[PDB]
Amino acid sequence: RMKQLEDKVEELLSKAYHLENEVARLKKLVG
Amino acid sequence: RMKQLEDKVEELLSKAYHLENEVARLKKLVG
């Protein structure tokens, strides 16, 4: 479970980073 | 430990939704 949970945190961080990059992209469009 | 890990997942999920919402605003705002 511990292993499952670690995996989930790593999965979530990855998704988080993907979206943060997207926001940046859009932030530039915006300016 | 298990619970610190559960908490971290909860924290990242909430962050990911915050960013999803955000990306959705920006996108509408830009195109």
Using CB atoms within 10 A of its CB, is residue B8 exposed (0-12), middle (13-18) or buried (19+)?
middle
Which of chain B's residues have a Cβ under 8 Å away from the Cβ of A16?
A: 12, 15-16, 19
> Cα–Cα distance between B28 and A12 in angstroms, integer?
25
Radius of gyration of chain B measured on its C-alpha atoms: 14
Q: A1-31 burial, b for 16+ CB within 10 Å, e for fewer?
A: eeeebeebbeebeebbeebeebeeebeeeee
Question: Which experimental approach was used here?
Answer: X-ray
CA distances from A28 to A7, A21, B3, B5, B31 (A): 32, 11, 39, 35, 13
Which of chain B's residues have a Cβ under 8 Å away from the Cβ of A6?
A: 5
Taking the CA atoms of residue A29, residue A10, residue B5 and residue B14 in that order, the dihedral angle to the nearest 10 degrees is: 20
Give the count of beta carbons closer than 10 Å to the beta carbon of residue B16.
19
Structure-token pair, residue A2: 């511990």
CB contacts under 8 A, B 2-31 vs A, are: 2, 5-6, 8-9, 12-13, 15-16, 19-20, 22-23, 26-27, 29-31
Number of domains in chain B: 1
* Structure's resolution in angstroms: 1.8
> Cα–Cα distance between A3 and A31 in angstroms, integer?
43
Q: Range of B10's domain?
A: 1-31
